[PDB]
Design an enzyme around this catalytic site. Structure first.
Site, short mmCIF file in Angstrom:
data_model
loop_
_atom_site.label_atom_id
_atom_site.label_comp_id
_atom_site.label_asym_id
_atom_site.label_seq_id
_atom_site.Cartn_x
_atom_site.Cartn_y
_atom_site.Cartn_z
N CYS A 112 0.83 -1.21 0.00
CA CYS A 112 0.00 0.00 0.00
C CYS A 112 0.86 1.26 0.00
CB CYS A 112 -0.95 0.03 1.20
SG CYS A 112 -1.93 1.51 1.19
N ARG A 115 -0.04 4.54 2.91
CA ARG A 115 0.01 4.32 4.35
C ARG A 115 0.44 5.53 5.17
NH1 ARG A 115 3.93 -0.62 4.77
NH2 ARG A 115 4.42 -0.12 2.56
N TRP A 284 -9.26 6.34 -0.75
CA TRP A 284 -9.55 7.07 -1.97
C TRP A 284 -8.53 6.63 -3.02
CZ3 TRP A 284 -8.46 9.84 2.62
CH2 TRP A 284 -7.13 10.23 2.78
N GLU A 289 -4.75 3.91 -10.74
CA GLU A 289 -5.57 2.72 -10.55
C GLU A 289 -6.75 2.72 -11.52
OE1 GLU A 289 -6.09 1.44 -6.23
OE2 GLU A 289 -5.80 3.60 -5.92
C1 HEM Z 1 -6.44 6.45 1.82
C2 HEM Z 1 -5.93 6.40 0.58
C3 HEM Z 1 -5.32 5.11 0.01
C4 HEM Z 1 -4.60 5.08 -1.10
C5 HEM Z 1 -4.24 6.28 -2.01
C6 HEM Z 1 -4.20 3.72 -1.33
C7 HEM Z 1 -3.44 3.32 -2.39
C8 HEM Z 1 -3.24 2.02 -2.70
C9 HEM Z 1 -2.85 1.53 -3.99
C10 HEM Z 1 -2.60 2.43 -5.22
C11 HEM Z 1 -2.75 0.21 -3.91
C12 HEM Z 1 -2.39 -0.74 -5.06
C13 HEM Z 1 -3.76 -1.28 -5.48
C14 HEM Z 1 -3.79 -1.98 -6.81
O1 HEM Z 1 -2.82 -1.86 -7.61
O2 HEM Z 1 -4.82 -2.67 -7.06
C15 HEM Z 1 -3.11 -0.18 -2.55
C16 HEM Z 1 -3.12 -1.46 -2.06
C17 HEM Z 1 -3.52 -1.82 -0.79
N1 HEM Z 1 -4.05 -0.97 0.18
FE1 HEM Z 1 -4.01 1.06 0.12
N2 HEM Z 1 -4.69 2.91 -0.32
C18 HEM Z 1 -5.40 3.75 0.53
C19 HEM Z 1 -6.08 3.34 1.66
C20 HEM Z 1 -6.01 2.09 2.22
C21 HEM Z 1 -6.71 1.64 3.42
C22 HEM Z 1 -7.67 2.54 4.24
C23 HEM Z 1 -6.38 0.35 3.62
C24 HEM Z 1 -6.76 -0.64 4.74
C25 HEM Z 1 -7.13 -0.19 5.96
C26 HEM Z 1 -5.46 -0.04 2.58
C27 HEM Z 1 -4.90 -1.28 2.46
C28 HEM Z 1 -4.35 -1.75 1.29
C29 HEM Z 1 -3.97 -3.11 1.01
C30 HEM Z 1 -4.09 -4.30 1.97
C31 HEM Z 1 -3.46 -3.15 -0.23
C32 HEM Z 1 -2.96 -4.41 -0.95
C33 HEM Z 1 -4.19 -5.03 -1.64
C34 HEM Z 1 -3.87 -6.32 -2.36
O3 HEM Z 1 -2.78 -6.91 -2.16
O4 HEM Z 1 -4.74 -6.77 -3.14
N3 HEM Z 1 -5.28 1.03 1.74
N4 HEM Z 1 -3.38 0.95 -1.84
C1 LIG Z 2 -8.04 0.77 0.28
C2 LIG Z 2 -7.63 1.04 -1.15
C3 LIG Z 2 -7.53 2.32 -1.65
C4 LIG Z 2 -7.14 2.49 -2.98
N1 LIG Z 2 -7.02 3.71 -3.54
N2 LIG Z 2 -6.91 1.42 -3.76
C5 LIG Z 2 -7.00 0.18 -3.29
C6 LIG Z 2 -6.74 -0.89 -4.15
C7 LIG Z 2 -6.81 -2.18 -3.65
C8 LIG Z 2 -6.61 -3.37 -4.53
C9 LIG Z 2 -5.54 -4.24 -4.53
C10 LIG Z 2 -5.55 -5.32 -5.41
C11 LIG Z 2 -6.62 -5.55 -6.28
O1 LIG Z 2 -6.65 -6.62 -7.14
C12 LIG Z 2 -5.55 -6.94 -7.99
C13 LIG Z 2 -5.94 -8.03 -8.97
C14 LIG Z 2 -5.59 -7.92 -10.31
C15 LIG Z 2 -5.94 -8.91 -11.21
C16 LIG Z 2 -6.66 -10.02 -10.76
C17 LIG Z 2 -6.99 -10.93 -11.61
N3 LIG Z 2 -7.32 -11.71 -12.40
C18 LIG Z 2 -7.02 -10.14 -9.43
C19 LIG Z 2 -6.66 -9.14 -8.52
C20 LIG Z 2 -7.70 -4.69 -6.25
C21 LIG Z 2 -8.87 -4.92 -7.18
N4 LIG Z 2 -10.14 -4.93 -6.43
C22 LIG Z 2 -7.69 -3.61 -5.38
C23 LIG Z 2 -7.17 -2.37 -2.33
C24 LIG Z 2 -7.46 -1.32 -1.48
C25 LIG Z 2 -7.36 -0.03 -1.97
#
Ligand code: HEM
Ligand SMILES: Cc1cc(N)nc2cc(-c3ccc(OCc4ccc(C#N)cc4)c(CN)c3)ccc12
Ligand code: HEM
Ligand SMILES: Cc1cc(N)nc2cc(-c3ccc(OCc4ccc(C#N)cc4)c(CN)c3)ccc12
Ligand SMILES: C[C@H](O)[C@H](O)[C@H]1CNc2nc(N)[nH]c(=O)c2N1
Ligand SMILES: C[C@H](O)[C@H](O)[C@H]1CNc2nc(N)[nH]c(=O)c2N1
Ligand SMILES: [Zn+2]
Lengths: 414, 409
Positions: A112, A115, A284, A289
């Protein structure tokens, strides 16, 4: 492992020293002879004997964080937890510990980039929920609070923890708000191709699809291990942004829009050995993304070609970089549209700069900051962002957000 | 155990068995991944390493356990005995240089790995000889713009006091100068090397694109300066197919990328001077060399001539100017018939290469962090390709900068 690990920023020369890796809990998938850092997913309930040390580890961490380690309240909390595991095979977190654990699962999420915000997380305790209708109520309230008329606020809603693995609470949706995808008989896809499988499940469960390009999917909610049930999110709760371009008047004619609130809902939150299998959380968006992945991935909306046509680029040679040119304009329009409508969004330059400051702060106050470079570096313009040149260490701390199998693959239908 | 890698765009799954052959370490442990860290003999150490390499050589030419294989091992054992080292055969040297490239997990260009001209320079004794060998390499590899991959291998390390080294980080590079007001003229990556050259007697023209001299060290002696004949240095003026003001920026670059500061390990032998060259991927110049904040750092100038709103990051002015610069680079090399590959074509070739290697070899070590290009990541196919990184030998390795070790005689 050695006590101190150093990372260097190759653009600024700043060297940081990591000691927090010594608290790493789980395997990464890597070994001394292979690195699996680009594997998406490398890496039946806990026994009493498994649970005891996991809870003590968390409780100790909690009381250390509030500067009461070894105190009377600490030792009493330990003993109360230990008795409860003995006589019930599980235990219940205090509200303070629930909030602390959820914030630290975010703090610990190596993938993330957002953070720097981790301590500003609104935590909704939904552990009293018993039915799918009540899950629906909790999720609607979450959506409305987090949306805040476009001034988005980060939030997590936490449903009851796993007990025997046959009474799980699950949100079957991958995000609370996503667009349906429909495979056509001719092989094409209408809507979002990423959601075709889940859309088919919803239709089989009874959903009547409008069959459009941007249909908000219903919620499919599972309480206490029962069969999941369908609910329509009130559309006034779903804030959306039509996409337009500050220079290209024709961009609006593409009919593109997207939703304001990213709310991932299929992950598992682990706190102290307890497993919260339904824990939707929202922040947000970072613009890429939407503009890079959701719009320009070949297996998503895949709009590069149509945008390049309207730009009248030469699309015969790859070396004209027509794809890179259109990709930039799409991402300009996405950021322009959210800003114009006053919906919170962050561009990839601002977000990665903030993450570097965050990581520097974490190294100095916490001894480190686990970070997954493969995920942190944005999907366009990588090397002109500061994270590209930043060495990172990836390792797994708990509390943590974990992947879990899709519920339709494991659910026992009643 | 067999390990699987998946491409998440095409859903193709490959099965890796080749990782079971690696012996060198990656830097990661079961608890910490160092995937983004840039840099994580005696008779007794030498013979198993030599034996392993001879074994895979003779297995490669389908004569494993043959009379020739048996006699080569005894020849090598006898030689390590009586000299504490050994000499590769010419066939072995060529096979080992090609496989060091084949095993280079950070190189997206490896579909070409078996098309490599190997120049054996193990007879060299002086820096004048090194300069001769290197001129021949530059002339051969440049080929009037039709670039040809090549490597020149100087004598191997003996006691570590007689190392052959090319002090340049590449055979052709532009000088960098610290300015009085504080800024940098030319290439900031080469400021330190430029000062060593000046201190060694090089008269600097103090321009923005001064081709550096060769600083060459033979047999552990003090290094000596040489000027590459300018007719051997092929350069491209950078212009843009639509922006006619672009040429007025005065940009140029050299056609031949020739890394000269790495170490080549074959069968336990260390070749500390082994300059190798191929051809450029456009983003190496247009993204990193021109737009790294600590390189030529030209994004501001270009966005100014494009009249972009530079007041806010979210206008993506940097991203726009970055694409236009990379269009100009590719357009310029192509118009001058100098070999270059764009990042779309290169990454497509690498996915194809991976498929070949998994089929015929059981895998392909690959470093996602380096393979994915520095712009437009997810619109290239490698972004969605899971990779396994592991270290096979023969290999190219990093080594210390010579000026940090050399006792100036
Ligand atoms: C507040 C603004 C936030 C921004 C700008 C942000 C940004 C991002 C981005 C750009 C990713 C990559 C997602 C992707 O490529 O699909 C990500 C992943 C992630 N975010 Fe953040 N996030 C935010 C808030 C949060 C919050 C509130 C949480 C949990 C409490 C969180 C937990 C995670 C987790 C666990 C991942 C990894 C998801 C995965 O492996 O599928 N994020 N975040
Ligand atoms: C809190 C928050 C804020 C933000 N701004 N962004 C977020 C983005 C993610 C996030 C991570 C991996 C994902 O998924 C990756 C994926 C790609 C391809 C396949 C396939 N096939 C499966 C999974 C997807 C999709 N929901 C979202 C999680 C939380 C977010
Ligand atoms: C023929 C065309 C070639 C192309 C298009 C190509 C492409 C690339 C690129 C883009 C990189 C990333 C370098 C950076 O970002 O600084 C790289 C790295 C590398 N290349 Fe290739 N390459 C080619 C030929 C070769 C040859 C002939 C060799 C050796 C015989 C080689 C060995 C390497 C090695 C060892 C690296 C890693 C460098 C390091 O770790 O610092 N490459 N290549
Ligand atoms: C054969 C071939 C063909 C081609 N087309 N391209 C290549 C590019 C490289 C290559 C790798 C790493 C580098 O080094 C990066 C670096 C960054 C920061 C510091 C520092 N401080 C030091 C080194 C440099 C720079 N010469 C070049 C190597 C071979 C290539
Ligand atoms: C194969 C590769 O690991 C995969 O495509 C990853 C790469 N990095 C990513 N980074 C982010 N932020 N999101 C992603 O979905 C991915 N996908
Ligand atoms: C810190 C990080 O590992 C470093 O900036 C790497 C990232 N990926 C790279 N990838 C390539 N191809 N070349 C590089 O120099 C780098 N630099
Ligand atoms: Zn690793």
């Amino acid at each position: 492992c050695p006590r101190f690990l150093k990372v260097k920023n190759w653009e600024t020369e700043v060297v940081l020293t990591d000691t927090l890796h010594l608290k790493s809990t789980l395997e990464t998938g890597c070994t001394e002879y292979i690195c699996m850092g680009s594997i998406m997913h490398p890496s039946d309930v806990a026994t009493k004997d498994q649970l005891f040390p996991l809870a003590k580890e968390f409780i100790d961490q909690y009381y250390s964080s509030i500067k009461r380690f070894g105190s009377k309240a600490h030792m009493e909390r330990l003993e109360e937890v230990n008795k409860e595991i003995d006589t019930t095979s599980t235990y219940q977190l205090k509200d303070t510990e629930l909030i602390y654990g959820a914030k630290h699962a975010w703090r610990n999420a190596s993938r993330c980039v957002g953070r720097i915000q981790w301590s500003k997380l609104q935590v909704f305790d939904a552990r009293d929920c018993t039915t799918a209708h009540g899950m629906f109520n909790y999720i609607c309230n979450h959506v409305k609070y987090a949306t805040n008329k476009g001034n988005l606020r980060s939030a997590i809603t936490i449903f009851p923890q796993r007990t025997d693995g046959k009474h799980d609470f699950r949100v079957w949706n991958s995000q609370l708000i996503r667009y349906a995808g429909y495979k056509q008989p001719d092989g094409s896809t209408l809507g979002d191709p990423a959601n075709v499988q889940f859309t088919e499940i919803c239709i089989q469960q009874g959903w009547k699809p409008p069959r459009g390009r941007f249909d908000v999917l219903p919620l499919l909610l599972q309480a206490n291990g029962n069969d999941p049930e369908l609910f329509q999110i009130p559309p006034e709760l779903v804030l959306e942004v039509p996409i337009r371009h500050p220079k290209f008047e024709w961009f609006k004619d593409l009919g593109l829009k997207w939703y304001g609130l990213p709310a991932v809902s299929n992950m598992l939150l682990e706190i102290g050995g307890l497993e919260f299998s339904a824990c939707p959380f929202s922040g947000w968006y970072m613009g890429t993304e939407i503009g890079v992945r959701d719009y320009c991935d070949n297996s998503r909306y895949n709009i590069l070609e149509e945008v390049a046509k309207k730009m009248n680029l030469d699309m015969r040679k790859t070396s004209s970089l027509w794809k890179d040119q259109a990709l930039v304009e799409i991402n300009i329009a996405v950021l322009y549209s959210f800003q114009s409508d006053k919906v919170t969004i962050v561009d990839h330059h601002s977000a990665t700069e903030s993450f570097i400051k965050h990581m520097e702060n974490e190294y100095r106050c916490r001894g480190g900051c686990p970070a997954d470079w493969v995920w942190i570096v944005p999907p366009m313009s990588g090397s002109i962002t500061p994270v590209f040149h930043q060495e990172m260490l990836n390792y797994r701390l708990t509390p943590s957000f974990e992947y879990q199998p899709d519920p339709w693959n494991t659910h026992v239908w009643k």
